[PDB]
Design a protein around this ligand. Sequence first.
Ligand code: 3K6
Lengths: 250, 1017
Amino acid sequence: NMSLQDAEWYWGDISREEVNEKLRDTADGTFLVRDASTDYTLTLRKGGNNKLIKIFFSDPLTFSSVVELINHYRNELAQLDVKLLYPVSKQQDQVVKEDNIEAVGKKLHEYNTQFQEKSREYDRLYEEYTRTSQEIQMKRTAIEAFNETIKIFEEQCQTQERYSKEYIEKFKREGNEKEIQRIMHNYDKLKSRISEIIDSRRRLEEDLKKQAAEYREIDKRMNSIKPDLIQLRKTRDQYLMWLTQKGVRQ
Amino acid sequence: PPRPSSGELWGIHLMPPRILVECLLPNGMIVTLECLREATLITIKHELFKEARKYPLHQLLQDESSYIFVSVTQEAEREEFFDETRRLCDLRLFQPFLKVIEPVGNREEKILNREIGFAIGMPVCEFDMVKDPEVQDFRRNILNVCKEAVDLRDLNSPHSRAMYVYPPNVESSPELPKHIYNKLDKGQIIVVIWVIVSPNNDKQKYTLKINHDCVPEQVIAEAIRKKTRLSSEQLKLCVLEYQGKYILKVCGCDEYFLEKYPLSQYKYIRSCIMLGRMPNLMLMAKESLYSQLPMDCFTMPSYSRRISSTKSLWVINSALRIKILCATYVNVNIRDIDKIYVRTGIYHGGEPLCDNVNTQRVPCSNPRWNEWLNYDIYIPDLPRAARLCLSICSVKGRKGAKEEHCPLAWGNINLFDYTDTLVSGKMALNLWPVPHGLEDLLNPIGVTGSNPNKETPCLELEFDWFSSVVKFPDMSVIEEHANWSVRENDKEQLKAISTRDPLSEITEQEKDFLWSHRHYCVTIPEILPKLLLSVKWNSRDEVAQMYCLVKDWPPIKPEQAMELLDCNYPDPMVRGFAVRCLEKYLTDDKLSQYLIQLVQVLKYEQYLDNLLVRFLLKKALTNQRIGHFFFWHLKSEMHNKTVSQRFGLLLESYCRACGMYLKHLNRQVEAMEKLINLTDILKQEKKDETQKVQMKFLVEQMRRPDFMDALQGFLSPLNPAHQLGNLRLEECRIMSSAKRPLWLNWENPDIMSELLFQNNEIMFKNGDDLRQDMLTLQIIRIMENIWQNQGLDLRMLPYGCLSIGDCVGLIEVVRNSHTIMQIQCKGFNSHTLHQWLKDKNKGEIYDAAIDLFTRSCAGYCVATFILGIGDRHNSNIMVKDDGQLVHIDFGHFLDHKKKKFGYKRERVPFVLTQDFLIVISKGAQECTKTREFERFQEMCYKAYLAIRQHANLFINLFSMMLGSGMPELQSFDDIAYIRKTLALDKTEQEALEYFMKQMNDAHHGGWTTKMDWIFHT
Ligand SMILES: C[C@@H]1Cn2ncc(-c3ccc(S(=O)(=O)N(C)C)cc3)c2CN1c1ccnc2[nH]ccc12
């Protein structure tokens, strides 16, 4: 009960959504105290969840102050089976390394400029990512349609062969040169066509190999921007909060 | 696979007028035949078989009538063309060819499977291929719902057929609001009954006056009496005994009064009373309709005829552990990130059952771990709906001590399968891309199961082996374990907890309280969602006890049971209870009103076969109005690989049993494919061409017989009671906006179209995501309904909007409307808007225009503020000539500016300009001091508090839409915005003070309250 509003764990007028960002992926024992929607609310991290414990905890009240109730469980805490360990400190003062309103304001304008430019590049990359992913899907469907087409034209050669074998046998024995030439001319036209369909599939397979490579490169570029964009927003938002606190408040 | 485009060939949107077709004869010969792009297959076959005589081995060819054509489609399917009346341009061919074959197998099954496959946008044969026994079980087992539905349809034929095709468009309750009843002349309505006195089809009107609660037959009886003849009282009574041979129809559309409901309970009539408009009905013979209704026949498909030790989970004495082996690859820049690891969690809904466990960090180039991960959960303590949620994350530890963690790919797996077997052995899981905007390392809201695209990061896993197959215990075993597990100011506390919103904070003290009083809770059954969140789901002792309470739990209102179907309630008993409530109490009216949310929560279901899908399919197959929207909402998501298998299998079972509606739906689908293709040509090949050149191309292609055949004579997908007749091409235009939407106009072919609307105007838009508008418009309809039922006549007039696919849909055009910018252009001054409305509404009708403007303006003022709609301006707000305000293109809702700008404030999208204030104040100098403005403020205050009282419904509706994939609706923290705008953590009086300050800040003063400061009186 040494201090009052000086305490590092007290945050005051901050929403549950803000506390959820502060406790995200934190170890069991992480905690912070804030003002209730009314009276205060202690939020404790336990088993991957944030636990809301109201401060009025049980009816026989042995706590004299908010700092006395916290420090009692901070040192030694089942009556469940969890003791208050690492408190979220007001660390956030270090993010803004400027003295006056003018210098902070100048740095916020810089960060916001960088953030909007990086946001615009991220959205452009995301549209390219989507478009590339969609076109890769189309080329994969078109290759399957080519495979099926080539199978049918091959079946056609086989069918031409089965049905002409005995007729070419007879025409050669009957001396009809014009009739054999007409058969092999059609077969040539069929083979010429299967060659053209095969080359078209081959070209599409190349374009897909190239677009699949572009995709991996777009994915890599986005996996690089994402963390840098998040950090930039965090900085920007921290400088904005600094200016709100330093400036005339309602 | 699904068709890449809506074009006539692969890489060719439109075929040239004449095209060369490679024809493969059954003798092995190839013939190149030039065909007209729109020639039918019967013509091509005849032209081919004539030509084939000039080619070798012609003697081996049978009569042309012995053969049909077969070819590869844009879906990579070998389709048999049994319908030779179809045109070459409509065959969806991959390449220009046709193979001649002798038709074999079951002709009937093949034709039906093609029709279903066309509707669904996916070949049926693709399902027969699927190796998963859960899919094959779904396909066979769902057929009992199909057979039930079709048998209920022939129960009382033909009335039961008519009731399916034309269900009554009725409200949920016959009771009318006082202000609606007072619009009547001592409980009586004046109705106009029309008779088509055949032949020559001559119209006669009967201005009839009857009681609002008159059943349709009672209305028919009065029309019989009031008919022009001469007969006495006893003669008019015996002629009335020969009635019940007639039915009532709405003039101008396909709405029928087939059921015995009060006339006022019919939405058309209720709307008529409200608007003060005269109801125009058409009397027709029962036989005229019953003869037009065909008998629907369901056929058992071919796949139905063919076929595709155990330890309890509770006897397994160990903790949970999963081995993460390796990942094939990750797409990362090795110079930008330091290490990669696998993040895992055990979830029940979006709540972890224990702390998250990570693997060790490893290099980008070498994604290998071979690490058993240990979870703080006893294997018997695993709830039935438990899931493994994982991701491969990247770590960038370059700036100070600060680390940057980002997910690269994610995946979710049900720890128990559809047969209650616990996962065992080795498992390969294909991972999914991270959704845009998602920053969390795990995605527990995301779908479960492997990514169907196998050209993605594949994570190799290993589950424990227990020398046998582990099954989750049966209910009998669960029930016995619950028995082994075993002043009144606290009764008031439970009442306060039950009234709170679904996303209000619940303390650990409240959880322990709710759990301690779980048996009294049964007195307040609506406390169930709050109580279920109090349960420790990581403890089989508590769950077993919760299952016992749920089994005997009293039913709750459907609007409350709907919450138990969202992503926070995954337990099959909880979801089962929720479904049983909807079966008993959910009306067709409300089912149609919340269908979109009910379809999205299907995505949350762990398995294909469940009580919800069976309930929805039964209803879609019992009511065509539901069936229509059930089909279109499922079809609109068929491009989405996360849900395409589930939605495709569902759609297959729907199309197999919907009867004749499949033919009407295929007509809608082909009209849409041609609109998609037309818009694709304009956006791609013709994008650098002028509006005049684009319009010449448009009028030329729309005039093609194949285009005129597909886009005339079909039902409107926005409302199937609306018949789209002949296209009025002189009214059809391309809009000057970026996405170049089509503004289309059709004739209404209804014999009495002039009494409803002679023209049907619809906008077709390709390029924009229409789901946000679709959701916004639906919320506006629910808000207006709350308002009307509470006595507030704040007319919104929300236009129809339907998403039909990936950034493609239909938007209903609001008749006789003009943007504020259009009015401002015709004039410059701030009085220009009020001047326009004076010129449009002269003398006597002036007051009704200002009133309508004020009422609609207040509705929009409150709705846009609560929702956080996209900013309003003179180009997205319109006014009808009667005064009715209509807001268009909402696009974004909730905190859509949260990331972009760090500012934390609730926006006022709709700030009433001096121009709007001048209208409300009837041209006064000081606008905010008028009695008109004071009355307008009172309307806003009433509208706002009315929505705040119904907050749980709106929060539930947004919670059910988290599955959708809308960027502004990804987490419950996104829904937190309406908790702020509705000031749910404040008192009713503080909330009104809050709304007033928001309006005061945006309008720079003028907003007052007649009520006192201390107590609002
Ligand atoms: C089809 C919907 C609803 N609707 N109803 C009537 C109109 C309309 C359009 C223009 C004009 S005008 O300016 O006087 N004119 C002479 C050109 C007058 C009325 C509209 C527009 N609208 C949208 C358009 C685009 N994107 C949208 N997203 C959601 C709705 C929406």
